[PDB]
Each structure stands twice: as C-alpha cells, then as structure tokens.
C-alpha cells in the first residue's frame, strides 16, 4: 500500500509546488513587456519569464526530500541540466489544447508558436515541444503525479558531472517507488494503464528537448546582441 513515508513525500511536494507556482501569474507584470508587432521581439519578455521560472524551480527543488543531503556541487549539476526540462513540464499547467498555447491569464501573457519563434527559436524545437505538451496533457495527471514527475526529473543520477550518483539514485528511487505505488493505489483504470511507463517516456522526450534547446541556445547566445537581452541567471544557468 501507500506507506506513511510515501504519503509524507507527496504532501511535501504538493506544498512545495504550490509555494512556487502561482496559477494567477501575478508576477508576470514585473517582466519586460511582450511585443508581437520585429526579430527577437519576444526575447526580453520570455528571457525574464524563464529567469523567474528558473528561480521557482530551484525553490521547488530545495524542498524535495533528500535533495539537501546532496553536496552543493551535485545540487548545482542537477539544477543546471534539469532546469529547462522542469520549466517545460511545469508549463503544461498553463498549456491548453484549445488552441495549442500557454495561457497565463490574459491575452498579453498567452504564448503561441509565433511568440516562441520571436524569441530566437525554430520549429525544430517548437514543433516537438508542442507535441510533448499535447502528450503530457493527454495523460491528465493528478497533481500528485505532476509534482512527483518534476521531482524525479530534477534528481536524475545520469546527468553528467554528478559525483555522488548512488545517493542521487537512492533519492530518485524513493520518489519513483512513491509514484509507481501512488498510480496503483489512487489512479483508477483506464487512465492508469501503463501510466508509469508513459511518464518515464516523457522524461526521455525531455532529454531530446533539452539537447535541442541547448544547441539553439548556444547559437542564440553566441551573438552578443542577443545575450544582452537575457538575464544574468539565464546566462549562468544555461551557459555563456
């Protein structure tokens, strides 16, 4: 059954996500304004959203049970490599099938394929990014499953540069077993059918999304006029 420890983990991750994810999107007023007039028009706005979103993912990560027993260097390696992935996962909450967009409360803050293009990216990222969002949306995850998936993604033992892999694995295992066991006990069929394996598949799709983004990001940022439009946190975390 679902153990007391496993119930505790889920309660922790729910609370952590709620503290780091404002479904009103009120802080979006602090971002440089969006412009949809203009090459890289949306880059200041979306650089800021991502920089904020990075901070929030760190604030989530810190509250993952076990995460803090990790050295600071390993915490750093895990956040640096997962940040884009967790922003992709956490964005599914604003993403809407109704029109294939991220809907953050108001027309001003509603982002589509054209907007992400006006931030320096192409369809080689955006198309499989949208398809990921659609496949993840169709799983109709319980918020419990959502927060566990983000957590499992942050604490991945294979990320390069991880010194204490075995501890990262043991931490991830606790969360994976919590998730397998939660699906079995609380997610009724047919929605539960192979749901775990479909969740892990999404982690594999995210590796490919990460790679592509890193490469488009390298190309974008090498141009010192675009790197000017980013934030210092985006520069340190994604690279320079």
């Amino acid at each position: 059954k679902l153990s007391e420890e496993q119930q505790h983990i889920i309660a922790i991750l729910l609370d952590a996500h709620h503290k780091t994810y404002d479904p009103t999107y009120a802080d979006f007023r602090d971002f440089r304004p969006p412009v949809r007039m203009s090459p890289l028009s949306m880059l200041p706005h979306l650089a800021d959203l991502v920089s904020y979103s990075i901070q929030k993912v760190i604030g989530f990560a810190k509250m993952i049970p076990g995460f803090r027993d990790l050295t600071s260097d390993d915490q750093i390696v895990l956040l640096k490599s997962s940040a884009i992935e967790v922003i992709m996962l956490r964005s599914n909450q604003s993403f809407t099938m109704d029109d294939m967009s991220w809907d953050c409360g108001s027309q001003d803050y509603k982002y589509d394929v054209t907007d992400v293009s006006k931030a320096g990216h192409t369809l080689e990222l955006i198309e499989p990014l949208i398809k990921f969002q659609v496949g993840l949306k169709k799983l109709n995850l319980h918020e419990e499953e959502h927060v566990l998936l983000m957590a499992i993604c942050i604490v991945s033992p294979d990320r390069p540069g991880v010194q204490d892999a075995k501890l990262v694995e043991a931490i991830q295992d606790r969360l994976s077993n919590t998730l397998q066991t939660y699906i079995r006990c609380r997610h009724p069929p047919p929605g539960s059918h192979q749901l775990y394996a479909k969740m892990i598949q999404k982690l594999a799709d995210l590796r490919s999304l990460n790679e592509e983004h890193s490469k488009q990001y390298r190309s974008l940022s090498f141009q010192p006029e675009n790197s000017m439009k980013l934030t210092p946190l985006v520069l340190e975390v994604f690279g320079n």
């Binding site: 901070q55 760190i58 600071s72 750093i76 956040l79 640096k80 210092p232 946190l233 340190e236």
Partner: peptide, 11 residues
C-alpha cells in the same frame, strides 16, 4: 563551480 547565483538561491 563559478555559479554564484544558483549557489545563492540553493543555500
């Protein structure tokens, strides 16, 4: 390793 802002947000 030279990640002052990340290390700050993590402390």
């Amino acid at each position: 390793k030279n990640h002052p802002m990340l290390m700050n947000l993590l402390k």
